[PDB]
Every structure is written in C-alpha cells, then in structure tokens.
Amino acid sequence: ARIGEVKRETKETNVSVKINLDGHGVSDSSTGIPFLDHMLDQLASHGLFDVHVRATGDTHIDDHHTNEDVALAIGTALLKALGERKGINRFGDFTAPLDEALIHVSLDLSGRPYLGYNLEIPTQRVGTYDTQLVEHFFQSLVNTSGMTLHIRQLAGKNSHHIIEATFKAFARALRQATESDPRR
C-alpha cells in the first residue's frame, strides 16, 4: 500500500496527515473545522482513500490558517504516497451530482501545479465555514502535490451541495488517477 505521512508545525497551526492511496475509505479527520472534517470524510469514502488528519491552530483568528496548512500537508502527503508514479492512470475525470448540484473534476498528476476553479458558492458561511476557503483548500493542495486540477460547476444552488459534490467528484477523479493502468 502507498502511504504518505506529513507532520508540519507553524507558529499558527500543528498538522498531521496520513493518506493511504490503496485504502478502504477509513475516515479519521479532526481539523478543528467541522465542515472541513465532513469534506475530508467525503474524500475518504468516495475515493477509497484512508485519511487520517489531526490539526490544531488559531481558529479564533479565523479558519484560514488551519484550512491552508491542512491542505498544504495533504498535497505533500499525496506527493509522498505517489512515489515514482509507476504504472498509474495519472489522469482522472469525473462528474458527480448531489441533488441539484453537478460538479466536473478533471485532473492530471503532472508535477506542474495548476488550479482552474469556477465555483460560485452563493452563501458566505456553510455552518461556521467561510466558503472562500474551499478554493484556497484546493489551491494549496495543488501547489504542494504538483497537480493539474480543473473544477467546473455545471449546476447547483445549495452551498453545502455544491461543495460536497465537488469533494465527491474530486475524490472519484483522484481515485481513478492514482489507480493502476492495467496496460502500463
């Protein structure tokens, strides 16, 4: 099994991540941001990744630093887990709904960071989670993983549905990309 682990401490946050690319969907995420924990559970269940995350940090300032540092660490953990990338599909492409929401994700484990993102989340807070932080989560993850990632909102009105459908589609695309190509 391909397992990547990262521990990172700043003056703002303390983060530990462990991801198994060849998992069974074991979800074990506690970031101090409940909505992000919910999305990381989606990542595990829809991607069949095992996801272990612990974070503490300066959430009294806002969720930003924690969200960013968790994302950065996940990207690095993914990079480590991938190793030499031998024999993998490398590309993933999936479009997933959640009720009225429909989100397309296309990615390439390319070594060149890029985020294309056009979500229009119509409310500012989902629970206590600042919806600007969704883009920053994916941007930071891309930057440390060296992923080419396109996220396209095809439909959606409920903010929780839009974000959750994004994580479902991303997880399924990433599962595809990380799985073995039977002809390689």
Q: Point out the annotated binding site for substrate.
A: 12, 38-46, 64-68, 90, 112, 160-168
* The length of the chain, given as a count of residues: 184
Which among 46, 47, 44, 67 has a CA at the least distance from the CA of 57?
67
Residue 180, both tokens: 């073995």
Q: Which of 106, 145, 166, 178 binds a copy of itself (CB under 8 A)?
A: 106
Smallest separation (angstroms) from Mn ion to the CB of 176: 23
Least distance CB 158 / Mn ion (angstroms): 7
Query: Looking at the DSSP assignment, which residues form a beta bridge with residue 162?
Result: none
Min dist CB 18 to a copy of itself, Å, is 20
Q: Beta 13-20 vs 3-9: how paired, if at all?
A: antiparallel
Are β-strands 50-57 and 27-30 bridged in parallel, bridged antiparallel, or unpaired? parallel
- 31: partner contacted, choices a copy of itself, Mn ion, none (Cβ within 5-8 A by kind): none
Site string for a copy of itself, 117-146 (x = CB under 8 A): -----xxxxxxxxx-x--xx------x---
If one asks whether residue 62 binds a copy of itself (CB under 8 A), the answer comes out as: yes
Q: What is the rounded distance in angstroms from the CA atom of residue 162 to the CA atom of residue 104?
A: 11
Local structure of residue 152 (DSSP, 8 states): E
- How far apart CA 27 and CA 115 sit, in angstroms, is 25
Dihedral sign computed on CA atoms, order 166, 132, 82, 153: positive
Residue 125 to residue 136: CA distance in whole angstroms: 15
Site string for a copy of itself, 63-92 (x = CB under 8 A): xx--------------------------x-
| Nearest distance from C-beta of residue 73 to a copy of itself, angstroms | 14
Residues within the interface to a copy of itself (CB under 8 A): 24, 34-35, 37-38, 48, 58, 60-64, 91, 93-100, 102, 104, 106-108, 110, 112-114, 116, 122-130, 132, 135-136, 143, 148, 150, 152, 154-155, 157-160, 168, 172, 183-184
